[model samples]
Target: MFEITGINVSGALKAVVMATGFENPLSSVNEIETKLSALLGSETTGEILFDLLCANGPEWNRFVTLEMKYGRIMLDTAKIIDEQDVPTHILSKLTFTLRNHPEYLEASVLSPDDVRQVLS
Candidate 1:
């Protein structure tokens, strides 16, 4: 089980995910949506922000699986420092998938944008 937490760009309070297991990333997304809905009301409009990390080596795979299952795409930002990191490829694949799948939106890498979109 993993616990995911959300915070605004300013590092303000947002939402939190309790101990969650790898069933579906959508489930976690849904939980995040629900919490955001409660805080921002049902009519809120914006995007969701996620600062994701893995505790194990398969974390990238887990994220990819979630993306494929949910029809969403992710961006890899690990290239800012090390160019040879493997996660960079994983993120690249995610970005490609996102481009291929327009049904999902790439909200923003900015923390504030994430909070505004997800929490409104």
Candidate 2:
């Protein structure tokens, strides 16, 4: 259910996306969007994007939650640094995770080493 370029965000994330009023699309865009929406909840244009966010696979949700917890602590404890402070290869990974999962935005304060279930 996940897209290659966008996270399937939900909860308050989905609510925020729908909060602002966007103008309805032209005819053709509506046609496809509503069709796409059918797989999510019902065939409709206005909230299709929001519904799609809800429709991401539960398994996909599990995969992201763990790394998100790891990345959050890494940021909190200062394992991440500004780009100029880092070697390229490792920096690339941290930066990517920071932007992509953004689990640091979650309420919990955690370090990855705290998760006994994580794979080494």
Candidate 3:
């Protein structure tokens, strides 16, 4: 825990949710973003693009370069983000939505290297 001159803050964790299970990656991502915006409000902190590097090589890549926010999940960022801007209740709701989303095959927390890949 840490405190500024007059405010104390604690238990704020940062993470990236790496997920892939889209039949149409671009559209599915868009839908997720829209749903999140409606559910969590449009406020955000940072942004990035979406790209994929697959084992099948360049041909299989989906480089949309779509405008995306690290805070898009309504918990967004470019290098991860503090949960402070988005309260715990909102995040828990997001978790529930992501877990049940039809187009997702898997969703989990990203490691630092994976986070770099997403941000890059």
Candidate 4:
């Protein structure tokens, strides 16, 4: 089973989910942006992109780039930490929470067919 632990809502996380065949691509994206904005207590604008691919191995993991529009700006990338290799249920919980959040801007899950289409 595969599960997501902590989601940082940056470019890299977006990229990994896209690569991993997560359901509803943009739902996760909007949630991340909202969470980041709420935590900072202000409107924030930026772009994050994921570059790491599974071909790089589990350790190589994912990479993200973050840019803030009107604040102390920084750029960095990080690997997925504490990947427990747990069951899909746990992952579902995490993803569901993100999707269910009232603040989520757009929530949509990729159907199994969608996953097949992408992976194929």
Candidate 5:
């Protein structure tokens, strides 16, 4: 255990649920961000998409197929983006949203052409 500003700030941890999850909202969001940042450090591309496709015993679905196709297109678009002198963060942001927010992917995921337009 340790203290913050001389006050103890340690406790036993448990599974995350809505009840305890919001107790410390900034920490929770920061933790999630840190986890994804660690993942981003480890690999490039849609590792999350790969996991969802392989999970549940190799089930296939429309979104899974779409995501795979989108992933492929991004490989090409990323090259274009770099060659055209776009900011690294734009592509990085796109990459994160692709793998991070599948539930809201409709708004987050961009068409390959749109990706190029924005970054290029």
Candidate 6:
């Protein structure tokens, strides 16, 4: 949704925001920038953030998979031997498929007016 400030962020990106533990009554755009950069690490450039904000299933999962692959390694003894198992492990690390948590995001989201008021 495009807030009055012209910040357009999708629910997918909002999920990522919540995954990084962004609570509502959002204070500043800089706060969003800070948390996302911390969670996404060096990968938080304009292109990636754009993909993240606009991304639905494909890009959201793609970004999550990249974070999973680059951020850690599995041990030889671990029986989670496939990509299916990896998402469970990875979600625990930051969180979510971004589409499955509508209720959470709905409640968490600031309405455009709400965001505008906060930002103003």
lDDT of each candidate versus the true structure: 0.33, 0.25, 0.33, 0.36, 0.24, 0.29
Clashing pairs in 6: none
Deviation of model 1 at 40, angstroms: 3.0
**Better-scoring candidate (lDDT), 3 or 6:** 3
lDDT of 3 by residue, 2-112 (tens): 000111112232222223432333335555555435444364333322322221112223322222444353323324233344445544543454345523323323343
> Per-residue lDDT for 1-120 in model 6, tens only?
211111213322222322211232122434445544455553332211211222221222323211112222112212212334333433342233334444433443335454233222
Measured with C-alpha atoms, the lDDT of residue 78 in candidate 5 is: 19
TM per prediction: 0.30, 0.19, 0.26, 0.27, 0.19, 0.23
Per-residue lDDT of 1-120 in model 5, one digit per residue for the tens? 000111011121111111111132222333433443343333223312111211121122201111112112122321111212323443354445434544332332334454344333
The Cα error of candidate 2 at residue 47, in Å, is: 49
Identify the candidate with maximal lDDT: 4
Q: What C-alpha lDDT, on a 0 to 100 scale, does residue 95 get in candidate 1?
A: 44
Q: In candidate 6, which residue ranges exceed 4 Å CA deviation? A: 1-27, 42-44, 48-99, 105-120
lDDT of 4 by residue, 1-120 (tens): 112234444432321232233243233455545545555535554543332222222233433344545432233422243334423543454445444442221222334353233232
The predicted structure with the larger TM-score, 4 or 5, is 4
Per residue, candidate 2 scores C-alpha lDDT tens digits across 19-112 of: 0111212213333334334433342212112211121211122111111121121112212123343235333443353345534212122233
Q: Which lDDT tens digits does candidate 1 get at residues 61-103?
A: 2232111112222233211212233244334544454345333
lDDT value, residue 8 of candidate 2: 26
Off by over 4 Å in 4: 1-27, 45-61, 70-120
Count clashes in each candidate, considering only residues at least 3 apart in sequence or on different chains. Answer: 3, 0, 4, 7, 0, 0
Candidate 4 least-lDDT 10 residues: 51-60
Number of the candidate with higher TM-score, 1 or 6: 1
**Deviating ranges (above 4 Å) for candidate 2:** 1-85, 106-120
**Model 1 misplaced regions, further than 4 Å:** 1-4, 10-19, 28-30, 51-58, 61-120
Question: Who wins the TM-score comparison?
Answer: 1
Q: Candidate 4 clashing pairs? A: 11-48, 11-49, 23-109, 23-110, 24-108, 24-109, 24-110
